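TICKET: design request
STATUS: open
ATTACHED STRUCTURE:
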């Protein structure tokens, strides 16, 4: 169970890396084209800020998923009789995963 949890964690990490690389490549290409066009750096900052916000948002979602898996594994490892799940959404996720 730990092994299958690890590999799927790598899979979600891999797709996250692919998305970040693609977005970063697009941001870098846009900046390079804008630099070649000799802009006043106002549009360079605007594009850079827009990309940075996108990078933060993607990483924010990635960590949301990462901690969701961490909570799932932690609950499973310490799962003891008479323990209570406050939220039904967590329980359905826990049973669906395992």
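STATUS: resolved
RESOLUTION: sequence designed for all positions
ATTACHED SEQUENCE:
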């Amino acid at each position: 169970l730990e092994a299958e949890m690890a590999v799927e964690r790598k899979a979600v990490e891999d797709q996250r890396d692919g998305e970040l690389e693609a977005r970063a490549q697009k941001l870098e290409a846009d900046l390079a084209e804008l630099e070649a066009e000799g802009a006043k750096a106002d549009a360079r900052r605007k594009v850079r800020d827009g990309g940075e916000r996108e990078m933060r948002q993607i990483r924010d979602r990635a960590q949301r998923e990462l901690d969701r898996l961490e909570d799932i594994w932690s609950t499973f490892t310490k799962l003891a009789p008479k323990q209570l799940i406050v939220d039904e959404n967590l329980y359905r996720e826990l049973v669906d995963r395992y």
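CLOSING REMARK: Residues 42-78 form the longest helix (37 residues). The chain has three helices and no strands.
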